[PDB]
Every structure is written in structure tokens, then in C-alpha cells.
Design a binder for this molecule. Sequence first.
Ligand code: FAD
Ligand code: FAD
Ligand code: FAD
Ligand code: FAD
Lengths: 385, 377, 373, 378
Amino acid sequence: KNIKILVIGAGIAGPAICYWLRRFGFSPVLIEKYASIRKGGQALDVRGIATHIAKEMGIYDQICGMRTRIECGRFVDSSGKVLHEEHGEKFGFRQDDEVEIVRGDLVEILMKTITDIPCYFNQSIISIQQNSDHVTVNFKDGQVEHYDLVIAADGIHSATRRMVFDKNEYQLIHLGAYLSTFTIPNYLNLRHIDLECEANHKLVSINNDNDPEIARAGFMFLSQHILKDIRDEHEQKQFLCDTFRDFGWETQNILNRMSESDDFYFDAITQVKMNSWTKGRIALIGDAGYCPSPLSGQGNNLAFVGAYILAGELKAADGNYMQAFTRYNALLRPFVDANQEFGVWVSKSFLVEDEVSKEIAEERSNRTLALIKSVSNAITLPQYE
Amino acid sequence: IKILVIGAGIAGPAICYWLRRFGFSPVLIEKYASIRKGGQALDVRGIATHIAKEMGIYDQICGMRTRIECGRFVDSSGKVLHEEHGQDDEVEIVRGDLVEILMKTITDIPCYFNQSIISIQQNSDHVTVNFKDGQVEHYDLVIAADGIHSATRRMVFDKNEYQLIHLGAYLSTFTIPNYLNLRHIDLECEANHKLVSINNDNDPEIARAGFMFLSQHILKDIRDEHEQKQFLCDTFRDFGWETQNILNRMSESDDFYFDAITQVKMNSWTKGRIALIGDAGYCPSPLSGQGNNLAFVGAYILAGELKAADGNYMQAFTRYNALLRPFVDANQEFGVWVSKSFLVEDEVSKEIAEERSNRTLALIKSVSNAITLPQYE
Amino acid sequence: IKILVIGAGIAGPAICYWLRRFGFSPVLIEKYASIRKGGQALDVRGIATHIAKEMGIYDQICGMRTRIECGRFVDSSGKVLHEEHEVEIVRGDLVEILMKTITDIPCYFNQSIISIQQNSDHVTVNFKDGQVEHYDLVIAADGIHSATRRMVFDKNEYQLIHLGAYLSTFTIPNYLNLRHIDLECEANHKLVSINNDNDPEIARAGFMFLSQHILKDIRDEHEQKQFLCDTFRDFGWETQNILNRMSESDDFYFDAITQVKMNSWTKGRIALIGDAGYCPSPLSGQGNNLAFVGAYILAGELKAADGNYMQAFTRYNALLRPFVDANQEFGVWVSKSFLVEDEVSKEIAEERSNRTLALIKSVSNAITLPQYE
Amino acid sequence: YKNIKILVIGAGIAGPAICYWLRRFGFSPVLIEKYASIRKGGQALDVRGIATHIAKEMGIYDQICGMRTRIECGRFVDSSGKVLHEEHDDEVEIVRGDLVEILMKTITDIPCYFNQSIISIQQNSDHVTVNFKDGQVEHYDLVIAADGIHSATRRMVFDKNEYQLIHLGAYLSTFTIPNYLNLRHIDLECEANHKLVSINNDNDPEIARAGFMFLSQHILKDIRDEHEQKQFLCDTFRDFGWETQNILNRMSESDDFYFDAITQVKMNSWTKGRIALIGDAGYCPSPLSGQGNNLAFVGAYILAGELKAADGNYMQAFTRYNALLRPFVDANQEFGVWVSKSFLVEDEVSKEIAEERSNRTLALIKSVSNAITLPQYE
Ligand SMILES: Cc1cc2nc3c(=O)[nH]c(=O)nc-3n(C[C@H](O)[C@H](O)[C@H](O)COP(=O)(O)OP(=O)(O)OC[C@H]3O[C@@H](n4cnc5c(N)ncnc54)[C@H](O)[C@@H]3O)c2cc1C
Ligand SMILES: Cc1cc2nc3c(=O)[nH]c(=O)nc-3n(C[C@H](O)[C@H](O)[C@H](O)COP(=O)(O)OP(=O)(O)OC[C@H]3O[C@@H](n4cnc5c(N)ncnc54)[C@H](O)[C@@H]3O)c2cc1C
Ligand SMILES: Cc1cc2nc3c(=O)[nH]c(=O)nc-3n(C[C@H](O)[C@H](O)[C@H](O)COP(=O)(O)OP(=O)(O)OC[C@H]3O[C@@H](n4cnc5c(N)ncnc54)[C@H](O)[C@@H]3O)c2cc1C
Ligand SMILES: Cc1cc2nc3c(=O)[nH]c(=O)nc-3n(C[C@H](O)[C@H](O)[C@H](O)COP(=O)(O)OP(=O)(O)OC[C@H]3O[C@@H](n4cnc5c(N)ncnc54)[C@H](O)[C@@H]3O)c2cc1C
């Protein structure tokens, strides 16, 4: 199985499928557009059947070792006055094998699992073509490589999806919200605490977990505005500075340190709707194919499942990408629908701030806990040895 | 450090192993669709046996050694003139079997067949390679191990910088069905500056034919197999003996090989980020009997000098050329020394012939140990 | 988990590899001072060939396979009568490969167990040098004459069956200058062979004969050679030249063709594998293949039981019973006509041989191997 | 590889450390522990000097950094609880228990038998006879003791003429209790009358670690009798005040009680035949040196390395081991004595003088921690 396979994107789906592809006898090559591993991102939750895959890969103990250590959580008003304080109650109500871990720590654990897999950074594809025999990949530095299969794991803004799929074959659905997170110097000397302030359909957060020198800032807000270019960091940062102008609290102290952050992340809360995630010798995995959006809390787990099934089906098809890709599209269909529908469900209430009572709030919260456990296990994983 | 190695013969695979063991990540290509296993018996000799032991393949090679029990020199009619019945100085092993052993040591290294380069450029930062299938790849280093007719040397070095010297003789060998039911025996017939051999060793169904003759003729296109075979037939048109029985089975052969006995002469074997190893740089010719050994030493030293220099190819390449020079000269000079009498068939005393044979065996023994290997641990 | 494997033959090394591959840390002991590489050509066949593949030695076994190119049957005066022109490998070569596969497993030599006891917690093993060790499990692979079987199992729980024949084989210098040939001479229900495979300096001699006699002490080497010389006193041909060179041979082997019949091969925390539990005898040609399967299944069942030997040993006996019966019975089937020399033509003999080839292939695949990762 | 039968006694720091390096070098050791589970007691330790390089080559440095102590505030208080002072080179501070855990996770491929202990040892020129508590008799090519200051193996193998235990005039005790004060990432300490009482919390919010250190020339009738230890500790702190009675009341709820005199082991050599002492069993530099764990690191490294360098020839290996460690043991043991000249002496001095003594202590331990150049065994 010396089949040439290209995997685009050193995020979560990308590194995960590289491990499984190698474990099943294939020889993948991994590329990343940025000069180094992007370890940004808020805390993620490895949950449901994804924990089972994590245990199979042999990383579940590492993930448990690098789990979030926040000891206290405070919601405050714009004056800093405490309204609600928690000390870990949130984690009790949740699923059993769920583990919360900062995204970059999870990516680092995944990158250590594929140290024997080639990985080239600062590598950008400019165009892709394919025929019955091979895929042609053209790189910005002048290289032209031929591959038997190409797998895209470059995120919801997948440039591969745009180079391979027509506009009539994929739809991006805006859920009326935006998310941003970045690390800054811990100017508040916070220790194992998360502070959040919600007002006027906006949320501002700042936390400290392990590194006492660094704090992670977070912004979430409702909006239907669309950027001229969702990939222009300068427009992203200006839009964030304008929406949170006059919010008060620690917003300006946070945004003033935004320029010295090395892990900036900003995106719209969006979903990718496709009838198929494969075209010829090219397959999409993770957010590139079926992003459930941050509001589902399931993007990383769907990345895990999609990587395992695609690599497994290729093993079961003895390299017949025609059959594997077809089974891949079918097996993941119910799981994608459950998770994406859950995400839309959450968006109906997210930051709405409708004047509801504790009864209404507790019912939505408990129904979210039940709904997310069923969704996280909405599929039974096959076996491939 | 991305490294391309060109040619899956002896030098190529062997340097892939030594680059991998020293930490590098080589990639190998081969022009032909499958590994080429043709060739006559070769000898792993001298300091090259030490390299083989360090590679962990010495026992395997010994296990695959030739097992010819009898060697008969015969006249054109079949009458036996001379008969013979024949160490860690030397292990004789058919070329194909040694190639197989080398390949099995680099199963973790990617090897791409039916792949050949049409253009090669380099700057101070990388080498750019354009392949026949339209691919373009950048490499930190390119090591050419594509043999005497190396296209890489032709595209990188000017006509001024290399010279191919014809030693006035030709070689051809191929396997045919063992129609004579030979068993661990080699039959040879020499006459009129020509030699015809046929042997059976390890596969009872297969016999290996061999032709060697003196000639100062040069083919119009040495790459044309049709010309090669036509020239071979014209040269042995009426040699007699089993010549026709052998040539008529040539079309059934899967491993036909034919070439002139040639040496490659260069003052340096490197240019920028591109280095040559094996026959592509310093072919000692079949008449030296040391090509594969000089390929082992060339691979081991080049990989080691890249390790000792921490990837500074400038340092490693200069060290490479210097350390290899005395070993190349001794082996090429021995090759030419052999060609002075090869198939000349001068009327000499049986004592003289025996004496020149003793001197040849003594000379190759010393030549095969002409340098001390550096240690790279 | 402390696990003791007794015997560095074929079954022993095989189960050590598998136990290690499944997470255990076995220890291997051997009665003799060094590994015993004696023996004639054996055949890896049937499901055993798949286990060899999963162990990563199949190609190694192929590389060291036999290379005999001609077989001649000859009369006592040297005149040829007949001439002829899955992997066959000499026992010593296969034992080499298996020992290379367990370089991470300790092997202590010159070790002899003298007493064995067990309770529901551990097995206690007494050694001749005075050591006393407790083990969670003890696995016996000490061959047909298993001292462990005799110490653990009552005389009514096992039966030794003599198949009425003997076998001896040893390597001597190649004084005849044989090259890749096997010369055999059959007469009076006795067979004498001498072959040369690869090493041109050595020839391997073989002796086989029918007999109902039993030795006073089957492990006494002097009585073995006396019985051998008396049996071939006036056979003629090369018997004297071969037997006169026994003293310079370093790998003398002699044994009776025997089987071991048991209803169960485990007792508490002790398990038998290989010839010690279900020896099918040389006439079956499946001893080494039965060693492979026993080692594979026993280790696998232990892994699946997460160390619970009660479940593993129960499944070990259950899964192996069909395979053992077929191979043991196949061996008895061969003995009824082995060296008997019935009055039939060569078309009948070659007909029986064709039946044997079909039968042995079915028997060598007479079970389906479970999977354990 | 090597399949020499090697027994390593003691699952602390030196023991697990040497099991790793022996296996890395081609050996197959076996580990035993007297107690039924791994002992994770003890105060914070410092991985320092050349011991940091050994930890890096073991691939545990980041794990050690990951579990580094994270006390945010340190308050020194009087017997009434009033705060008198509040505090806010590749070396890492880490609780001893967490370092033992890490080390046991680097030897997961080596057998480790708990509730195992030796009753007697014999040896001849061919093997060592180790007789076990559960009735086993085993022969070993090499036996390596890492069973601590009161090494039962040393007392079985070495005569009282070959080792000397030096009392440095002080005693130490530490044990975990329920965090009845509800402390978080803080260390509370109180010193008076040549006694020091501490109580802190770092990671487990339900558990606090108590500390006791005092000066005394008294010697226990039997140093291994816990009852005499605690009776001595309670009588020493009878009228101390502060939290001493609260802490010592919760002693019976502790699972990791540690009590010991601050002592050193003085031997001319650390080997006899096929038996070798490593760690505190041979050259314990005392807690006042702050180097026991690091000396255990270097001892395990050099003994294992010299055995590989001599291809299992214990005669040659034991000779290099004794010679090479001598200068390092000398500097660390001497530094521990030097600390004891001022430890808890409480001399009337300026805060400039006390500061100067601390600066000198830090500069000295820096050099003592790098007092030898490590050999390379590749
Ligand atoms: C830096 C970062 C921070 C994030 N933070 C959050 C967060 O706080 N909350 C949340 O819910 N989700 C976040 N996400 C998204 C989250 O990772 C995904 O929703 C999901 O968990 C994993 O999906 P994925 O691995 O398929 O895609 P991603 O995690 O988005 O990974 C895609 C990877 O491909 C790389 N890439 C993109 N384009 C190219 C290209 N042309 N060539 C090569 N490589 C390319 C990207 O740099 C990235 O490393 C973040 C993603 C990133 C990259
Ligand atoms: C099929 C064959 C048979 C031979 N038979 C004999 C013999 O009988 N006697 C003798 O003395 N010597 C023989 N030789 C030459 C002998 O192997 C060499 O003299 C020496 O032993 C090894 O040198 P080398 O590995 O550098 O070159 P070679 O052994 O010649 O190996 C060169 C390899 O590079 C490949 N190659 C060539 N051009 C290209 C290209 N443009 N791109 C990619 N790959 C390329 C070739 O297919 C071959 O696999 C033979 C070589 C070959 C290839
Ligand atoms: C030297 C030798 C030569 C053989 N030659 C042939 C042959 O030519 N043809 C044939 O059909 N079969 C032969 N056999 C038997 C053959 O190996 C088996 O039938 C089968 O292939 C493998 O069975 P086994 O590994 O269970 O037992 P064996 O191969 O017999 O191995 C048993 C091992 O246990 C050891 N052992 C015995 N008693 C003790 C003890 N008390 N303590 C510790 N270790 C002990 C033995 O020394 C031996 O190493 C031979 C066996 C041996 C040992
Ligand atoms: C529970 C405990 C707490 C400690 N607390 C401190 C502290 O607060 N401050 C300080 O400076 N030092 C402390 N030490 C000592 C410190 O670990 C050493 O100074 C050094 O760090 C490591 O030396 P070592 O591993 O050689 O010895 P140790 O750390 O003492 O390790 C000895 C090990 O051997 C085991 N053992 C003892 N006798 C036997 C036997 N007969 N059979 C089998 N195993 C046996 C012990 O249970 C222990 O696991 C403590 C040691 C222990 C065991």
C-alpha cells in the first residue's frame, strides 16, 4: 500500500487521519499553510464515540493529563461585580468519558502520534486538477506533485473544496453569530479562573488555566453582517473592535493586547451542507465537509469519526477509493445530521437573551445535556483491526 | 533534508540505507518499471565486505552465494581442454540476488518506478527537478546513481568535466531456458578474441549465457537494443559451439544486458547540491571486477560525510571527493591493467600465464583494500 | 504476571513470542546447556503457515528452505532403483529463526525442575540448584518425555502409545562428497539415508526402522546407540561408514515414535503444549505444526481472558481438541503401512502417497484459528 | 542485549531510575518494593544540575515541568497566626510523589512486585542467593539495593565496620492530611525555638501536606518504630501552639507518614562482590543537602552505564562506579553538613545577614549540583 495520499491541514481531522492511514498500512503526507502548528482555540470536549477512538489511538491518557484545570468560574457585569460563581458543578452533570482540553494541547498530542509521517509547513496549494489516473497538485513555490488520493482537512473555509467542488454542490449556512479567541499576557494575574460578561447579545471572556503568564480572551456575539473577505484578519479585527466598542469591562484592555497575540482566531458560526463529501480521487473530512459549527461543540469529535471511517473503509476496500468513498458518505450521513441539527437547535437560544425564567433556562440546559449525549453517540463505529 | 537518489542498482539502494540509518529521509527513483535483476556473478570484496557486515546483510549474501561446482573450458566442438572444481576476502553472488538483498533493507524508503528526470536546475537554496510525467519537485540534494550512461551527469556536468574511455571490449549476459540440463556447472569457450559462456547455478530451469569480445568499434546508438543484438550476432556469426542455440533463445530472455567495457574519468564528482556515486561518477569497467565494491564505498562515505558535516553539503562533498580519489584511481588503474591482456591471446608459456594470473589475484586483493574506511558511528 | 515456559524447542519459543506480543513477560528455561539444533527436515504446513506469517518469519523460513535437487533410492550394493527431481526446512534452521524472534525474552540454560506443586493462588517450582520460585502460570514444552507431565498428572490421566518404530538422525562430515542430493536404501523394514543440502562439508544421516522393542532407559544415550548398531549390524551399504562417525557428530538424536493421549492438557494453573501434551509422532509430519497452533491458541486465549486462566485453559482444551485428534490419528494412519512393504506395484504405492498428500493437507487445515490482534 | 539476572530493591527514586537505564542499555532488571503500593509521600524536591540533563535524556523533563509545584503565596506566621512575611537554571521543583509516579511510568515494561522483601542474602563468586519473605529462593547475577537510608540490604551484606551513619543534629517529618484549613495554592509556615511547622496545599484541593523540622541531639532507641517516632514528635511539639495539635490529631488519618533523622551514610566503597548500593542506601546526603534525589539520579545513571561499558563485567563496572561517584558524593555530602551548621540555629542577625547567607547557600548548591562531568554511554 504505497498509494500516494495527500492530507491538507494540520488541525484535528488532518493529523488524526494521518495516524489511522499509517496504522492501516498507507503512507500519507501532511501539509500546513502556516509556518507552524496553529495551537490556538478555546477548550474543546472529546465526547461520545470520539473518546472510544481516542482510547483506540492510545492518547486518552495524555488527553486526561492535559485536561482543563480551571477551578472557578465567575459571570460578572460590566463593573466586575460577581453575579454567578461556580467551582466545577458544570463538569459533574456531563457525560462520563467526556474530557475537556485546550484545542492546541489536543493538536499537540495528535502531532506526536505522527512523528514518523512527513509534514511540510508553509506549503500552500494554488490549484488542483484530477483525472482517472491521478490528482495534480500545484504549489505556490513552483512544485507540481501527482497523488493517487487527496484528502482535505483545511477547515470550513476549505480552499480545496472551492478548487474541486462547484458552487452548486456545497452551501455555507450562517447561524447569525461570530466567535473569536486569542491569547494575551495575563495582565490581570488570573489563576485557574474564567471570567465572563454577557450583555446585549455579546459575550466577553478571559481565563487562565496552566501557564500563569498567559490569559486566553474570548468574544462571541450575534450578528447577520457578512465580511467582505472572511479571511482578512484586518477586517476581522476591525469588526470585532467595532462590535465591542462601548461594551466596557475589560474589553479595551483585552483588545489593546490583540496585536501581540500569536494565535489569533476569528470566524463566523457556520455550517457546511453537502450531499456528498467526495469527488473522484478527492475526499473532504472534518469541517471542510460537514462543519457542525462551534454551537454544536462537536467539530473535533466529528473530525475524529470522519478520519477513522474514511481510513478504515479504504482499508476494507483494499484501496478501491470508489467503494470506500461511497461507504464513507453513507456511514457518516446520520452522524453529521444529528450533530448539525443539534448545533442549529442550540443557535435558537444562543445569546438570544429572551426574558425567560429559571424554569425555562433549567429546562433548556438539561435538554441540552441530554441532547448532546445522544448526538455524541448517534452512530455505531465499525471495526477494521 | 529531502534527498533524491536516482537509480535502483547497487550504489543507489545502498546509499539510501546509509542515509536513512544516519538520520536522513531519502527518496529513490528508478527509470525502469521494475527492479533490473540481470547481470553476471559479481564479487563483494575487500573493504566492501566490511560495509556489508556493518549493513547486516553479509550472512544473507553468503546464503545466496554462487554454487558452481565445476568450471570447464571447452573447444568449439565440445572437447574439454581444462577443468576446475572451485573466505571472507570475497563472496561471489549473482548481481540480481545482491540487488534483491539491498532492496529488502530499504522497504521503509519510498521507491518510485517508471520515473525519470528530463530537466534539472539548481540554485544556492535547492535543486529543481522536472520529471517525465510533468511533476516538478525541489530537493535539498540530488544523488545520481544511474550508472555508466548517467543522464544526470550529462545534464549537470559540462562535456568539459567528464570523459568516457572505451577499453576496447564488450559484455553481454542474459538468462535463457536451461536447454542443456546443466547442474552447477559453467561451460566456456574462448577463440579469436571472443568468449562464450553458459552456466547453471541455483535455478535448475534457467541457464545464464555470457558473451565477451574485443572490439574497437563503437555503436551508432549504444542505447538501441536492436543494434546491440545485431552487433552481437554479427560478431559471433560463425563462432560455432552453442552460439546459435544461445542467440536463438535471446528473445525469450527477460533480463537482457549489453554494454561496452568503459570507464568514466572526472576530477570531481560533485557540483553544488548534486553528487554522483557509483558508475555514474567513476565506473571502473567490468574488467576491474570492482564496480559494485566501489559503489558500496562511495555510498557509505558520501552518507557518512553528510552526517559528519551536519548537512553542510559543501563540507561533505569536498571531503567525499578527497577521500574517494585514491580508491577510485587504484581500481580504475587496475581495470586498465587487466585490459592490456584481456582476450589478447598472446602465445605465452603456461608458467607465464599462471604467473600473470597470480599477479592479477594479488593485485585486486590489494586494490580492494586501497583505503581505510572512516568511522561514522 | 509470572509465567514459566519450560523447554526451548519449537512450542516453547513460539509461545514465548506470542505471550510477549500479547502483553505478558514470559521466562524460558532449557534443560540442556545450549539450544539443541538437531533434527531432520520438517514441514511448515497448513494453518501453521499463517501463524508463521503473522509472526514475521515466513520469508525467513523461505530463505532457509531445503534445496535438495535429486532423490535416489538405492540397493545395498549402490545400484540406483528410482530417481526423482508450505516450506520444508531443517529443524535446526527453524529453531534458529524462532529464537531470533524472542531476543527480548530471557532464556536460562542448565535448568532442571525437580518438584512442582500448586494451590489456587500460584504454582511453586523447585529447581535442582536449590531455587524455589512461585509463578502464576507454568507452561510445559519439554517434549515427548515431559518430566512436567509426569509430576503434575497422575498415571491414569495420560497414556503413551508406541507406534512401533524408531528414528535417529545426526550430521557427519560429507565423506561421500554429495551435492544437493538424498540417498536412501530401504530393506527389511529399515531405512538408511544420507543427504547433502547446502553446507558442502556436512552430510546428514538418517535411520528409521520398525520395532516393537522398548528400551530400558529411553534417555540413556549408550543404550540408544547399542540398539541402533544392533539393528543395522549387517545392513551393508554405508551403514558402517555412517555409524563409525557418530563419535564426531555434535547433534545426535534418537527417539521412539510415540504419541501422548490425554482428555485435558491443563490442570489448575499448569498447561501442556507441544509434544508434551499431544505429541503426534514423526510419522504424522505435524509435530512442529501442532507446536505452532498450541502456542498460538494458548497465548491468545490468555489474552482474551484478560489473564483469567480458568476461562483461557478451558477454551484452550476445547479449541485444540479437533485439531489434535486429526493430526494424531493421521499419524497412526501412516504407521499402519509405514515400512511394512506390501506386495503392490509402484502405481499402488504412488496412489497411497497421493492419498497421504491429500489427507495431510486436510489435517493441517482441520481447524479455524481465532483472532486476537 | 543482555539477559543477566539483576534484582533492584526499592521503588523510590534511585530504584526506578536505574531500572530505566538498565533496560535502555540492554538489561532486564526486576524491581521489588517492601510496601504493598508505591510510596508517594515526601515534600517538594528540586531536580537540579547535571540531574536535569539525565532527566531530559529520560524524556521526563516536560512531564516534570508539567507537574511542577505551583504554590502562589508563602506566608510565615507566628504561633498566633499573624503574618510576619509573605512571599509571592533548568531546575524544576516537584513534589516527591509526583516524581516517583513519573519514574514508574518510564519503566512500565519492567516487572515490579510489591509486598516483597528479603529476609537473608548469601553470595559466592557465581551468584547471589536472595531469600524472600514469601518463601522464594532465587539466584541472581547482580543485586542492586535502592532501599534507602536504613537499607536492610546494606545491613545484611556489609559489616558494621564498612558503613557509618552520621547524625546531623536534626529531624524531619512530613505527611498529608485532610485540608481542614481549606488552603489553596499556599504554604503556611511557623518557626520558633529551633522548630519549624508547615502546612500547604498545591494540587489536590482536599489534601494538605504537613511538615515538621527541628534540631535535636537525641537518637531514637529504634529508628524504625513508628510509635516511638510519633511519641517523640508529639513530645517535641507539646507546647508549640499554632496548628500543631490540630495537625498531629490528624496523623492517624494519614497514609504516607514519613519520619526520619537527618543523617548521612559514610562508606569508603559502595559495592561488595555482586551487590551494589545506590542512592541513600550508599551515600545519603541528607535532606539538608537538597540533593538526595539528584544524587540518586546520577548514581543510577553511572552504575547502569558502567555495566554496559564493561559488557556486564561487574568487576570492572563496580570499580568505575565507586571511583567516578566519589567526588560527586563528597561535594554533596559536605554541602549537606555545611547547611547543618546554620539550619534553624536562629542567630540574632540583620535581615541583610540572613539574606547574605541565603545568597551564599544558593550559589554553593549551584556549583555542588554540577560538581562532576557525566560520562557518555550513547
Ligand atoms: C487556530 C484555530 C483555532 C480554532 N478555535 C476554535 C475555537 O475556539 N472553537 C471552536 O469551536 N472551533 C475552533 N476551531 C475550529 C475547530 O478546530 C474545528 O471546528 C474542529 O474542531 C476541527 O476541524 P478540522 O480539523 O477539520 O479543521 P480545523 O481545526 O479548522 O483545521 C484546519 C487546519 O488546516 C489548515 N489550513 C487551512 N487552509 C489551508 C490550506 N490552504 N493549506 C494548508 N493548510 C490549510 C489550518 O491552518 C488548520 O491548521 C479552531 C481552528 C483553528 C485552526
Ligand atoms: C541490468 C544490469 C546488468 C548489469 N550487468 C553487469 C554485468 O554482467 N557485469 C558488470 O561488470 N556490470 C554489470 N552491470 C553494472 C554494475 O552493476 C555496475 O558496474 C556496479 O556494480 C554498480 O554500479 P551502479 O549501481 O552505480 O550502477 P548500475 O548497477 O548500472 O545501476 C544503475 C541503475 O540506475 C537505473 N537508471 C539508469 N538511468 C536512469 C535514469 N535516467 N533515471 C533513473 N534510473 C536510471 C538503471 O536502470 C539501474 O537500475 C549491470 C548493470 C545493470 C543495471
Ligand atoms: C534435538 C531434537 C531433534 C529432533 N529431531 C526430530 C526429527 O528429526 N524428526 C521429528 O519428527 N521430530 C524431531 N524432534 C521432535 C520435534 O521437535 C517435535 O516433534 C516438534 O517439532 C516440536 O515439539 P516440542 O517443541 O513441543 O518439543 P521438542 O522439539 O522435543 O522440544 C522440547 C524441548 O524441551 C527441552 N526439555 C526437555 N525436558 C526438559 C526439562 N525437564 N526441563 C527443561 N527443558 C526440557 C528439550 O531439551 C527441548 O529443547 C526433535 C526434537 C529435538 C529436541
Ligand atoms: C515515603 C518517603 C518519603 C520521603 N520524604 C522525604 C522528604 O520529605 N524529604 C527528603 O529530603 N527525603 C525524603 N525521602 C527520601 C528521598 O526520597 C531520598 O533522599 C532521595 O530523594 C531518593 O533516594 P532513594 O530512592 O535512594 O531512597 P528512598 O527515596 O528512601 O527510596 C527507598 C525505597 O525502597 C523501599 N524499601 C525500603 N526497604 C525495603 C526493603 N527491605 N525491601 C524493598 N523495598 C524497600 C522504600 O519503601 C522506598 O520505596 C523520602 C523517602 C520515602 C520513601
